[PDB]
A paper describes a structure:
Henipaviruses, a genus within the Paramyxoviridae family, include the highly virulent Nipah and Hendra viruses that cause reoccurring outbreaks of deadly disease. Recent discoveries of several new Paramyxoviridae species, including the zoonotic Langya virus, have revealed much higher antigenic diversity than currently characterized and prompted the reorganization of these viruses into the Henipavirus and Parahenipavirus genera. Here, to explore the limits of structural and antigenic variation in both genera, collectively referred to here as HNVs, we constructed an expanded, antigenically diverse panel of HNV fusion and attachment glycoproteins from 56 unique HNV strains that better reflects global HNV diversity. We expressed and purified the fusion protein ectodomains and the attachment protein head domains and characterized their biochemical, biophysical and structural properties.
A crystal structure of the Gamak virus attachment head domain revealed an additional domain added to the conserved 6-bladed, β-propeller fold.
Numbering used by the authors: 174 to 631
Write the structure that this text describes.
């Protein structure tokens, strides 16, 4: 019933030269997945840091489990479940859980993320001897552990010590983001967050316009990567690549995303695309827009980056706005979109939500500079602290799910939940967009190199 979304097919409007532009709309109905939805706390245990991956028919879903008052040091195991996304006669898909595992060892599995390839599930975890509130910022960590899972049961476990991981930076702490990894070539590629020393600052992304009460923009930009009193500890994103050889030997590498390519280490995920992969990031910091970096064979550079000025992060729920300028305020909320075309020039995601200020969640479909469609949703939540959107083919139609963490209004209970909604694809003469007041418009491009708007009257 469920397969990966074929992005090339979804965007193939080429047989329609008179309506050649792909576009997308959000279907008005949100559908529950009750078997994948649960409170954070239940009967002396907490289930935190949810992460999900989708494969051919299967999903892989995982939470870190803690006992007692649910501090970091109370972590007891990693719960992982594998099931299928199926039609059970409802208007939206449902989960059919097949296997649940409780993964554990003497060391803590301090941070884990999941991936799926075909009907095989993978769980990659950072291991540590001690796990505290400070592990994410200062470590230490001892290595990685990789679990291979199928419907029947666990197949294999692999591990590698930190000293055997090839790295291009001085890495003091390593955490995996909640977004899934992706199988690419014979490897698994995951996004990580690392505490790093001795980094190069050349080319740090930083505006050159005037910023309030700042003469040295560059220094403010560099300083804003730091989360602790240690002046030589920068919080940055890394790409974690793991391989298992036929002999069953695990190798791993961790590659820094330099300051010239990305902002402070933030949540995100790896995106599969034809011919490569991308890194979708929901910045914690002052550059408060979604960014997407993808492999670029043509360009000698590794990653080509897209800034979605149209798609704000949750930054402004809790930090002051204004001209985009380096400041210290950060949010830990995050919203990871996914791509709807091969190049990621069209993305879809779900906004977060505060309990104040007329804050509302929205599903939004965007290009870098425009909003294609948006829909206010999740009035049943008083707040939403994180979202991860993933899309797939179900019943031969484009569908998406969102994994979110938030507080339900009716009960005040914090929950992790997964819900689904259908997408509508069409091929159009002129793609329409929404202006800041919600009026729909399109551009009547001209051959001399000009564009003018026009209002869509329904
Ligand atoms: C999203 O951000 C909010 C605001 O910073 C976080 O809520 C704060 O942090 C904890 C809640 O766990 C409390 O100590 C504070 O009182 C909260 N403030 C408010 C206004 O609620 C929230 O935890 C974040 N959620 C995620 C998933 O990042
Ligand atoms: C690192 O890898 C080498 C080569 O496989 C192996 O001999 C060595 O035991 C590993 N080190 C640790 C600490 O496991
Ligand atoms: Mg369900």
């Amino acid at each position: 019933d469920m397969r990966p979304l074929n992005l090339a097919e979804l965007n193939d409007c080429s047989r329609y030269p008179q309506t050649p532009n792909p576009t997308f709309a959000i279907s008005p109905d949100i559908h529950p997945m009750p078997e994948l939805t649960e409170p954070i706390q239940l009967k002396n245990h907490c289930a935190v840091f949810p992460t999900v991956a989708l494969g051919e028919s299967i999903y892989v879903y995982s939470h870190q489990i803690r006992k007692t008052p649910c501090k970091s040091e109370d972590t007891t195991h990693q719960r992982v479940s594998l099931g299928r996304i199926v039609d059970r006669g409802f208007s939206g898909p449902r989960a059919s859980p097949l296997s649940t595992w409780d993964l554990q060892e003497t060391e803590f599995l301090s941070s884990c993320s999941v991936a799926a390839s075909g009907e095989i599930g993978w769980v990659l975890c950072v291991t540590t001897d001690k796990f505290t509130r400070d592990t994410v910022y200062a470590g230490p960590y001892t290595g990685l552990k990789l679990y291979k899972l199928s419907i029947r049961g666990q197949k294999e476990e692999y591990s590698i010590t930190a000293n055997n991981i090839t790295t291009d930076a001085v890495i003091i702490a390593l955490t995996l983001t909640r977004g899934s990894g992706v199988p690419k070539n014979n490897k698994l590629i995951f996004l990580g967050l690392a505490a790093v020393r001795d980094v190069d600052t050349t080319g740090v992304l930083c505006p050159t316009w005037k910023c309030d009460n700042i003469n040295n923009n560059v220094g403010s930009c560099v300083h804003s990567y730091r989360l602790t009193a240690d002046m030589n500890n920068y919080f940055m994103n890394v790409v974690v690549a793991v391989d298992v050889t036929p002999t069953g030997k695990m190798t791993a590498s961790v590659s820094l995303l330099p300051m010239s390519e990305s902002y402070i280490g933030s949540e995100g995920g790896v995106i599969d695309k034809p011919g490569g992969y991308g890194l979708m990031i929901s910045n914690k910091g002052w550059f408060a827009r979604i960014r997407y970096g993808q492999t670029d064979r043509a360009s000698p550079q590794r990653y080509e980056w897209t800034d979605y000025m149209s798609f704000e992060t949750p930054y402004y729920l809790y930090c002051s706005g204004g001209r985009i300028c380096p400041v210290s305020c950060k949010t830990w909320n995050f919203t990871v979109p996914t791509i709807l075309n091969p190049s990621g020039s069209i993305i879809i995601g779900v906004k977060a939500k505060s309990k104040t200020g007329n804050s509302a969640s929205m599903i939004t479909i965007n290009t870098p500079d425009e909003v294609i469609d948006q829909y206010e949703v999740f009035n049943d939540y008083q707040s939403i602290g994180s979202t991860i959107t993933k899309c797939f083919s179900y019943k031969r139609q484009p569908w998406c799910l969102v994994l979110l963490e938030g507080v339900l209004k009716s009960t005040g209970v914090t929950e992790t939940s997964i819900q689904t909604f259908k997408i509508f694809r069409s091929c159009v003469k002129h793609r329409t967009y929404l202006d800041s007041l919600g009026t729909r418009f399109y551009y009547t491009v001209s051959d001399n190199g000009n564009k003018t708007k026009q209002t869509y009257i329904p």
